[PDB]
Design a protein around this ligand. Sequence first.
Ligand SMILES: COC(=O)c1ccc2[nH]c(=O)oc2c1
Ligand SMILES: COC(=O)c1ccc2[nH]c(=O)oc2c1
Length: 110
Amino acid sequence: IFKPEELRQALMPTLEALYRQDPESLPFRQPVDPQLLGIPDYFDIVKNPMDLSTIKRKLDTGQYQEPWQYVDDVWLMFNNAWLYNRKTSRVYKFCSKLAEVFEQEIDPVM
Ligand SMILES: COC(=O)c1ccc2[nH]c(=O)oc2c1
Ligand SMILES: COC(=O)c1ccc2[nH]c(=O)oc2c1
């Protein structure tokens, strides 16, 4: 059982492990900007965007009350990238690498 005030110390190492993957985490560090990136259909396809900076802000500022909410946002981020990007694409393959790192880091914590 985690109390809300324990979540950052327990879960931040799993998020730091994702950020440490370079270049794999770079497309995930900030919200997808469809006009900037030249992908104007992004928000037509992806209904609930999520990225590392949003997860980090929520974890820093006490917006998560239970660990499932953090895990849920991490999988939202990965599933959005698998949904929007083609299986052959750089971002999709980076997503798969990050998801493998995440599974290895989150399992001992939970
Ligand atoms: C999207 O998932 C959920 O709405 C949800 C809600 C409560 C939970 N309690 C738990 O342990 O996992 C949960 C998952
Ligand atoms: C999580 O980041 C994406 O889903 C993403 C990022 C950069 C991209 N550049 C592009 O052409 O598609 C992209 C998709």
